[PDB]
Amino acid sequence: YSSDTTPCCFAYIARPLPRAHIKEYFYTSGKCSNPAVVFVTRKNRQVCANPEKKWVREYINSLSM
Amino acid sequence: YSSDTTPCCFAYIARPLPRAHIKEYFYTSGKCSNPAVVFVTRKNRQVCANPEKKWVREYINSLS
C-alpha cells in the first residue's frame, strides 16, 4: 500500500471561483474521508470544492473540453 | 475548515528510511483519519510513518 501522502479536503469553497481563473482540476483520493474536486487556479492555488454542486459539475464539464 | 488541501497518510513505510536522506518532518493534520508523521526527503518526497514506532520517534528527536 502506498506510503506517499495524498491531498485531502476538509471544507469546500462556499462561492464559485471565477471560471476564467481555473486551468485544471483533479479529484482527491477515494481514501479521503470526503469526496472532493480540487480546482487549480492560474496562480497555481489548489481549491477544494463540492462535487455535488451544480457550478462545480459545470466547471468540470467545461474543463474536460 | 480551510478549503486548501492537506496531506494525509493511508499506509506507513515498513522499513526505516535512511536518516541521511531526511531533511525535515511534520505531523499530518488531526483532520486526517490516521495519525502520521511525514518525513520529507532531500528530494522532497513525503513519506508517511507510524508515530508509534521507536525509529520514527528517534528520527523526530534528531530532526528537532
Residue numbers in the entry:
A (entry chain A): 3 to 67
B (entry chain B): 3 to 66
Quote the authors verbatim.
To neutralize chemokines, ticks secrete small cysteine-rich chemokine-binding proteins in their saliva with no homologues in mammals, termed Evasins. Among this broad range of chemokines, the chemokine CC-motif ligand 5 (CCL5, also known as RANTES) is of particular interest, because it is one of the most expressed chemokines by activated platelets and plays a prominent role in the development of atherosclerosis.
To prevent higher-order CCL5-oligomerization, the E66S CCL5 mutant was used for further experiments, as it mainly forms dimers at physiological pH. Unfortunately, several trials to crystallize Evasin-4 in complex with E66S CCL5 were unsuccessful, primarily because of the precipitation of the complex in solution, even at a low concentration. These crystals were used to solve the E66S CCL5 structure by X-ray crystallography. As expected, E66S CCL5 formed a dimer and had a structure very similar to that of WT CCL5 with a root-mean-square deviation (RMSD) of 0.63 Å for the backbone of the full-length protein.
